[PDB]
Each structure stands twice: as structure tokens, then as C-alpha cells.
Design a protein around this nucleic acid. Structure first.
Ligand SMILES: NC[C@@H]1O[C@H](O[C@H]2[C@@H](O)[C@H](O[C@@H]3[C@@H](O)[C@H](N)C[C@H](N)[C@H]3O[C@H]3O[C@H](CN)[C@@H](O)[C@H](O)[C@H]3N)O[C@@H]2CO)[C@H](N)[C@@H](O)[C@@H]1O
Lengths: 272, 49
RNA sequence: CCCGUGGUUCGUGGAGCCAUGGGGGAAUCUGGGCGGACCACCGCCUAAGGCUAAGUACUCCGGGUGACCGAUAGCGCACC
RNA sequence: AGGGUGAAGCUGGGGUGAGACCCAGUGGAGGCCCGAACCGGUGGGGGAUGCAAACCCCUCGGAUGAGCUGGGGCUAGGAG
RNA sequence: CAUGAGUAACGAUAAAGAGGGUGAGAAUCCCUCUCGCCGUAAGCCCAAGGGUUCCUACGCAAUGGUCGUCAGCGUAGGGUUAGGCGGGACCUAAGGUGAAGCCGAAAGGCGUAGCCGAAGGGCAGCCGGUUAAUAUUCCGGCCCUUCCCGCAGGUGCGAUGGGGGGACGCUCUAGGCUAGGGGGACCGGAGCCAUGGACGAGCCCGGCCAGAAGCGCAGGGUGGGAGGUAGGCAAAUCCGCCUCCCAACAAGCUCUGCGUGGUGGGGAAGCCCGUACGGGUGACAACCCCCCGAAGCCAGGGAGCCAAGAAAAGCCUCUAAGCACAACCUGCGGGAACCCGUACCGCAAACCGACACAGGUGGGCGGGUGCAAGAGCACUCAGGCGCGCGGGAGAACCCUCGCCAAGGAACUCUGCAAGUUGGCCCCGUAACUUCGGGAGAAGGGGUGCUCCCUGGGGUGAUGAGCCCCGGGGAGCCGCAGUGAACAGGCUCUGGCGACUGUUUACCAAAAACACAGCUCUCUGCGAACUCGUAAGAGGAGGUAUAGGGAGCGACGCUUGCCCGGUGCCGGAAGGUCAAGGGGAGGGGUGCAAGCCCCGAACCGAAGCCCCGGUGAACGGCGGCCGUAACUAUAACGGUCCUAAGGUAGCGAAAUUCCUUGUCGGGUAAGUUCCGACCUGCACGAAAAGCGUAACGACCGGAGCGCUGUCUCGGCGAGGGACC
């Protein structure tokens, strides 16, 4: 029920460089799931470019485990949703009920794993940080206990356990930074399920992108009647500005944001 | 040649009606205004069927 | 009483009194704002609750009068 | 409407260790290719108080996709 | 109220001519007879929307673009009725409302819940007959629907709260049934040879449609238990988790074919009569046989592929609590069932454009022949017409369309146009290439129809039952054999751009913008922005492979020189200043304690200065002078200047004015383009630079082909012009 990434159509005219992926569980989801409105327009004013749609399923997923902190679960199997950067495992809880959950590193259908008060540090179970075997990996992870799985490292194979101090453990998050969460808080054990996805290649843009749902963006689009920047000519403007009365693209946003100093440091950057 | 007309028993009837006018304050207001300021009636009455 | 503002014949000013948005932050008739930014005087009024009549306004509607109009002026509109 | 194209998987036959990979059959995917209904509307032509407040003709592009379309709705006018 | 004007014009070049009729008058009404155009629509059909009108009877002064005894016109009267069609008496999404709640100077903003709110859900009938007129609504035959009263048999019955459940892409697609095509000389029938012929498997007409369920084709939708039954999906045997047996092409329970009760219809002619709307009409039928079949139906299939496809009845399943003695499941009898709806127009003179405007406007085969296939083609079936002003000769000339020869672009800014050319089958097919392809490259050749020998996929084996090519052979007639209508002109080459596209409604088919894919860079989620007066939503039930700002824009090679100024990014040591904290001190009044100013030593926020950082960040990347045996530049030869001073590729280009630059090619000649050169008036990598196959209604340069296009064209047909 894993999934092929690479399959690429071939020379079926410019449908060139189209990357397929196929989770093998292929089953159509199950019983627990509604749908999302057609947002893009919202609070009934309209906003943010692109946006279009394309077919309609729509998710409900588990984001909180302490709610059975124990009932082993066995991979119902693999599958996913018209959302999320890295598929899911519909899991079965030994008590009858099941739940759509993450999809850490390639686990295995039928596999038992669970979590709570002491779970075996086997990628799959989840645990209050504290049970953090420092130097290990998780994601999903949530600071401010109860505030549900906060930091759903999307396909975000990224929760790197980095030491502890006080009632907070240190973590290396996607981004390339290290924040802190009080141990009692929690983490889904292990890592994500998708990345190659991230590399996926798609053919005739219009076709693909739109299918994605998203349409466009078109800067200093000539007639700068608005389009912040210049136009009514070839030449790329100067000032150094962006759409809807913008600050270019090299300035802050944070602030006192009591948030900030409160934890984390590394400051915002990487260097591949 | 989509000369924009082509009404809809529904749509038009719909969009506009006594109710509706009384709903929006502007609706109501204009209502009375016209109504007794100069007689007539109310197209939101104009309706058919 | 400090600044941030409204009133008022006051548009920033030596600019007073009433009035309030911020922070300060009390006096029972030796009480306390008010005449003169302000200080010494005399004087003035009695504040931070309540009630209403009567004299000017208005014209739907009625009556009446017109060096006010005659059907393209008069209400556009003298009559389904 | 209709027609051609002819990938991927697979099945078998072919060559190493198995394998690559080949060939053949199957297949019959979106791009699509051809071309009506459908949707656009240059290229030339035909009206100037024209069938018409944007047309008729000969013609031409897409002809499963960011496609076309009836019904039901929300955003609107210094806003969309 | 005049004026061109009694000229321009009548709404489509889909033609009409006759006879009789009725009339005050009939090109322009009625019948009937000749005749053309639709037919894939000028068909019918549902729906929308119109809302009169529809009919029947009188009438025409207004109205139709004149007519007019015609009407959709005027006057009057009559005309659509349904437990089972539809919609509500039910369900719900988006979506509006909104008891709560959060929120505004006010008016409101936001809003769960419950509600309103759909040809999206769900639900019980069909066919034959009858009116001037309406119909599965009426009549009749046939088949049911729930709800109420009862009774008869049967049960833990008994919410709508838990659950299971109805529920869902797209592409495609096996198997199975009517629709629905089609030949039956196959049976019924009213007739015929007119004309050289044939009365002969001749023509012409028809040879069904509905039918409880009973039943026979297809399939169409799965598990029995038991127990544990640490979830339950709060409350309990119903689901789901674990386990041991039976888990059978299993019995299961939901549409077709026959049924057949059985009813009903049943057409040609034909000729009798009404205007017609019509009717008798032959027994009145014969109503059987064989062929082809779908995107329809069974069916929620079945495979494959992602971009991975809605919420309320029904079956159960327990409280409430009744039930359980009168609750539910189930037969028979009895009795009930209301509200709003049809007329007709209705791809259009009745719906939308102010007109009987040739514009537009949603789904239902779309009869037949032929064509490889087919809603395109040409002629037609039914069914629909004949556009509503006529007759007339027919000259100018615009229109529409036809033919040419001699030459075949010289016309011309442009081969604008138009002609060439085009239907399938076989021979065959270039530089280049992302080896997908450019190929319908390109260039040939073919087909018609006869008779003859020869193989095939159909259908109950398979034998008058059909579709595929056969294959080949001899031969037949035309200038001619996709014989008419559907139907590529082509090749070479260059700039741009990738290619699919959207737009510019009103010129601007097409670059621009898309874009896939590049890089910078922004944000830690109560992200960052976007609207908002809070409230709040949005964002994202997403959660830095993620969500934003951006210049570019497949891909290939490749992105170099400066951050001294600008913005942005980093550090406040220091200089620097608002309010403030503030007190030195001066000050007016104070006989006086005192009351009150001014007040400024010092502390004091970002910012600003300052110091680094900094281009896929604004934005820029030079000037001059000298030297190698001689005659020509090239190397630094040091200097003036600044931040350095433009690399790689690139060049007279969608940037060279001197320019029709100079050479070269093309050419009788060419400022045109291709190639060179390169002293680049004023290219350069990121608003990309050089290149780069495929793809363009791209724009430009060749050349073969063809053609009243050009040397003038010349006659010709159809329409106005003209009487
Ligand atoms: N290594 C240098 C190589 O040669 C050139 O260098 C260039 C550059 O460096 C240098 O530029 C310098 C700059 O001071 C400024 N532009 C003024 C100065 N006159 C100039 O120098 C010039 O004049 C010099 C004295 N008369 C001579 O050495 C020579 O002619 C020339 N270099 O001069 C060269 C030409 O402008 C190429 N540009 C480069 O690509 C290549 O690598």
C-alpha cells in the first residue's frame, strides 16, 4: 500500500515530465468524513489569487492521542485524502473504532503500534515528549499540551529531538530552527511518509496547476493601474514593491510577539 | 444575442418582492417614499402568475 | 488639576466659563465653581437628580381672503 | 455524431545470473491527429436612414479540457 | 406643417401556374389539381417564459410594412377538472434565515441550533376510445397507492436520538433484453396491364401496442453462528475490534422475455360527402417469419487511472416508556384521500432585441437511400412550407455566380482573393530529432461496371438467411469511372514565442498575459498577508517538501564585474531628539503661612547619523596616452577618473541614423530577406544572454503547382436599378 513516485508518462505530447504515484491500498476511504465549502471567496469578501478546486472528497483526521492512550492499533492499512502532503493510514483501534492517522515512515499494514503513558519508542507509536529518547524523530508534535497535534509536519519529515531543559524539550523543526515544548506535550513517533511527492513533475501547466485547483498570479502585470509595480511598458520597475500595497520581500513580520523569545532560537534560515 | 433581457418568473420574481424590500432598510425606506410620496404601487408587486 | 477634544462672536492664541476622552483624583453652608490668565479683594451663586404647563415653529387636513393664474401659467396634475 | 493514432501495464517467444533490455500480441491512454452538433469568432466579401444599436456569406481555430452547457447561489459598482 | 419623394425602401433569390368556389371587391381567403424548398430540418416533444389566447359565431372603419369578404385583428359566447403526471402536504448542499452567543455612535456586522430554501434526494399507473376545443386528468379496459375503522392471524412492540444505509470520479468496457432499423411474394386487401414489352417470387398497404403475475431467457445488488462483545457510535442483545466452527458456479431479497387473463387499435387505395377540424371506409383485416442492433435499460456491473467522486426516508436497533392486551409485523372486509396546476405559442411573427425584426435561448431517435464511418454531404419519409406587396420588359452599373483563351504574375505594398488542391487503398517518405516526430512530408498509382475460377468473420449445426475483404482472371463502355454533394496546394527559409490556452465585449487570431518549470525572499502557525468599526472570517481542519511577495519563464549551454549612493538585512558603543520623570533656578500676586507660573543640570522610544552586511535587490559596468628591425592594428606602457568598469555567447538585428554600410547569395535586374564582416549612432544574462525539435489563422524572404489575377478582359445567369 506504499506508492510509486517516478512513473512518468512518455512523449504523449508535451504531457512530458508527468510524475505518477500510486499508494497500493487503493481502497476508497471510510465512514468518517464530510466535505469543505468552496473557499477562496470567504467571510464573503473574496481573497488570494489562484484558487479553483477540482472534484470533491474532504477530510476529518485524528490529531489527538491521549484519547485511548493505549488501545493498540493495527494499521487498518494505507490510503489518503484530497488533502495533506503525505498520505495516511486508516488505523484500527483494537476496541472496534478506527481513525485516520498520520502515515509515518513506511510502517506496515496490520502493524501494531499505539501510544501514551510509555509507548515503545518504535516509529508509529506516539508519546508525551518527555518519553523523548533525545536524538530520535517524530512529527505531528504539539507544544501546549491538549492544544492538539500542533505542528503537523505535513509530509514534514522534520521533528528532530534535540536535548531538553526545564519543562521544555528542544526540537529542530522543518524550517531549520529549534523551538521548545513542555515535555508532557506530545509527538507522533518517527517521521513522515512523503517527499518524493515533493519532487513530482507535472505536464502542461494549465492542465496540471489548474487541476491542482489553483489558477494564477501575474505581477507588475502591465497596466499597473494597481499591480503595485510598474507597467504600461516593457521594463521591470524599481521602487522595490509588491501587490496589494506591499513591502517587497526582505523585511520582518514578527514583533514583541511575546511568542518569539518565549522559545525557539536558530533564527530563520538554512543552507543547502 | 443575449440582449440581457430574458427574465425569470423565478429569478426576477425572486430577487424582488415586498418582503425583500422591507428587509433592507434602504428597501423599506424607498418603499414608503415612493409608495405614498407618489402613489402607484410597487413593482415588487409587479409580479405575475 | 495634566494633556487629548467640543462648544462659544474665539481659527490656537495672555484665551475665560460650560462641556467630555484619557491619569490623577474631594470638599457639608469658615462648604465649593463663578466677575478680573493668574495672585491679594469685594461681590455672585448655590452646581456633579427630578416635573410640566403659557407666549415664536410647522404644515397633511377644514374655512376664508388675494393691483395671485386661465387652459402650453397655474399643483406637472381642473377630473376614470 | 463520426474516424485515425497508436504509449503504460500485461501475456507469450528471445537473449544472462537472475536481470537488463528485444521482439511480438494485447492494449487501446488526452495529446490527442482528422474532422460536424458545441465553442470561438481572423482572412477576404456583402449592408451603410442596412434583417440588426454589432449582422449574412465564402472562409477559419479548438473540436475532453485550464472543454461547453440549463437550473440554483455569493462577491457591486472608489467596491467588484 | 412642409422637404427631398410620390424616386429609396417591404425584412432574406426556398419559384410558383391552373380550375372551380365565396364574396360589394378577392395577385394577395376556401377546396381541389399541376409545381419548387425543407427532412435533419423549415421535425415533432418536455421545459422556459408569454400570458392571452384556443375554438365556434358574427364584423373589418384601426392593425398587418397596400391588399384583404384573411388573422395570432374587433364583438360575443364556450373552452383546460388528475389518490396514482408535476409541486407542496417530506429531505437537504451550496445557500438565506436565524432562539443562543460574539460583536456598532446608531442604523448593523458576524451566527450554532431548528426552519426556508433544488427537474440534486425520494414517491403509489398504463393504454385504447370521446369533445369546436382539454386528457395517463373524461370514458372504458386492464394495475396499483398510503391513511383511517374494524375484524383475522403474527410479535419485547415502542423513537428518531447511536449505528448500519441509501452514495455517487473520470476513461473505458464483457454479458443480457425491448426501442428501433431492415428483406419476408410471408398472409390479409382495394386495384393495374395503359402506351414495343411484363399480370410474372410485379407494384401499392399493412403485417402491432398495452397485459396481475404465474411463469421461462439475463443478470443486476453476499456471508450463518456462537461467544469474548474491557469501542460502544454516552444509555441495552443492533454496528466495529478478537476467537472456534459452517462460510458452496449457495437459498437470498430488487428491473427485462414470455405471459397471457385480455382489451384495444388495426391502412393502404378506394370512392361519398365537410372549408377544413373530418368520415365512412374490405372481410375489415392479415397482425406469423428471418435479418441488423445502441451512448438505453438490467445494474448500486466489471477493468484501468488519479486530479482519488453531497447532506435528510427505508431495514433494522434499543429509551420514552408504554408496550404487552390492546404498541408494531401481517391478510380480508369496510371507509378515505384536500391545496396550487392542463388551452395554445412555444429553435419561434405569441419567449428575449422598442417592429409579422434572417440575432439568441436548455435536454428527447433525430424516418430513408447512397457515401468506408458518421445528426456533414445530394434526393427524399412522414410532417413542414411557398418568407406576403404584385405584372413588366429586361439597357448603365454594385451586387451573387459561370465560362475562356493567348500568356500565365508581370497586378499588386502584399498572389488580398480566387483557382490549385483535396473521398479511402496500395507503391513510397527528406535535413533534423527532446528518437514522441516531424508524414495526410513528399511523389506514384488506384478505383466504375460485366462474367468467370478461388479464401473469410455471420446466424439454432448451419442449406434461398448477411456483413469483411478476398484474391485473381478475361473483358465492357465513355475525355472522362470519391463520375454530383460532402472534401490538403505545396516545398525551402528566417525573427519571435515553446507547444493548450484567455482577452482585447466595440477594428485590433495575435503579441501580451498565462504558464509547467528558475531564483530571491516572507511566516511559525491563535503563522504571514486580504477584507473587517471591533466582532470575524478568511487563511489552513493546511500546518514550512507547507501557505504568501515576487523578476523569469519548456529544455540545452550558461548565468561574470561593482554594493562608494538607494532600499533591505545585522549591531544601539557612541552623537542625536517627543512625551515624560523633572529640579537648579527665575517669577507675579502674597502684609504673611501661601497661592499659583516660567521652569530646565541629568535620566529619557523608535527612529535618524554611524559601522558591517547586501543583486534571479534599485541601479549602474568607463576616459586618455605610449612601445615589439621597416608598411596595419593587435600584448601593456604607465597614466586622468570612478564602484568597478561588462565575461561568455551576440551584432548592421520586433535596437546601424551615416544606410539602398561593405562583401557574398539570391536576381535580367533588389534599399527585400539568408549568409558573412563587425568602427555595436544606443546589444549583454535575469524585465534573462546564445541556441533550441515540435507546435502559430504568428510577421517577413524564396521557389514548383495552379488559377480572368494581371496584360483591358469578352459574352453569360441570377438581383435591384428602369415602365
Ligand atoms: N585581463 C584583461 C583582458 O583584457 C581586457 O582588459 C580590459 C581592462 O582590464 C582594462 O581596462 C583598463 C581600466 O583601468 C580603464 N578602463 C582604463 C584603462 N585604459 C584600461 O586599460 C586599457 O588601457 C591600457 C593603457 N593604454 C592598456 O593596458 C590597454 O589598452 C587597456 N587595458 O583594459 C582592457 C581593455 O579595456 C579585457 N576587457 C578583459 O576581458 C581581458 O581579460
Amino acid at each position: 500500500k506504499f506508492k510509486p513516485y517516478t512513473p512518468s508518462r512518455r512523449f504523449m505530447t508535451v504531457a512530458d515530465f508527468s510524475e505518477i504515484t500510486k499508494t497500493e491500498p487503493e481502497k476508497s476511504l471510510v465512514k468518517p468524513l464530510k466535505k469543505t465549502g468552496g473557499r477562496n471567496n470567504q467571510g464573503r469578501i473574496t481573497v488570494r489569487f489562484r484558487g479553483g478546486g477540482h472534484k470533491r472528497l474532504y477530510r476529518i483526521i485524528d490529531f489527538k492521542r491521549w484519547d485511548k492512550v493505549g488501545i493498540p492499533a493495527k494499521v487498518a492499512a494505507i490510503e489518503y485524502d484530497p488533502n495533506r502532503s503525505a498520505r495516511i493510514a486508516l488505523l484500527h483501534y483494537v476496541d472496534g473504532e478506527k481513525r485516520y492517522i498520520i502515515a509515518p515512515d513506511g510502517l506496515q499494514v496490520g502493524q501494531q503500534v499505539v501510544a501514551g503513558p510509555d509507548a515503545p519508542i518504535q516509529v508509529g507509536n506516539a508519546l508525551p515528549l518527555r518519553f523523548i529518547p533525545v536524538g530520535t524523530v517524530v512529527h505531528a508534535v504539539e507544544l501546549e499540551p491538549k492544544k492538539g497535534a500542533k505542528l503537523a509536519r505535513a509530509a514534514g519529515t522534520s521533528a528532530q529531538i534535540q536535548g531538553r531543559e526545564g519543562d521544555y524539550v528542544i526540537l529542530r523543526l522543518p524550517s531549520g530552527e529549534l523551538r521548545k515544548v513542555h515535555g508532557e506535550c506530545y509527538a507522533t513517533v518517527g517521521a513522515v511518509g512523503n517527499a518524493d511527492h515533493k519532487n513530482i513533475v507535472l505536464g502542461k501547466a494549465g492542465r496540471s496547476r489548474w487541476l491542482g485547483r489553483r489558477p494564477h498570479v501575474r505581477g507588475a502585470a502591465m497596466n499597473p493601474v494597481d499591480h503595485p509595480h510598474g507597467g504600461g511598458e516593457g521594463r521591470a520597475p524599481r521602487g522595490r514593491p509588491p501587490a496589494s500595497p506591499w513591502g517587497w520581500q526582505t523585511k520582518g513580520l514578527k514583533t514583541r510577539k511575546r511568542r518569539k523569545p518565549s522559545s525557539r532560537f536558530i533564527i530563520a534560515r538554512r543552507k543547502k | 444575442m443575449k440582449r440581457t433581457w430574458q427574465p425569470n418568473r423565478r429569478k426576477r420574481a425572486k430577487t424582488h418582492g415586498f418582503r425583500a424590500r422591507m428587509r433592507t432598510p434602504g428597501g423599506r425606506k424607498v418603499l414608503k417614499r415612493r409608495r405614498q410620496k407618489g402613489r402607484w404601487r410597487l413593482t415588487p408587486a409587479v409580479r405575475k402568475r
